[PDB]
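Write out structure tokens for Peptidyl-prolyl cis-trans isomerase FKBP1A.
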Amino acid sequence: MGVQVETISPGDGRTFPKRGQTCVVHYTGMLEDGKKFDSSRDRNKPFKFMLGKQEVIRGWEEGVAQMSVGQRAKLTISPDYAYGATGHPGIIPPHATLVFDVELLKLE
């Protein structure tokens, strides 16, 4: 499958990221069993990426583009939109479905 976006808290419902904009997000990344492997919240510093430059997994590019500013959403991402068959040794196993809790704080 692709990426599924499920709302946790609504945003403004009007402002969606366009290609080339910088998205400022807080996120927590979990394996499908619920094990956390990465979180900007634990570092207390938001994560920024430019939409359309493939600095993040494909599931993020397509998923965050469906969020409005201020929204918190749960992204469920199949391995082809993620780290695939290879995964990431010792962090992400092969063929891993990933779950992301993502809050879109602002656009720059």
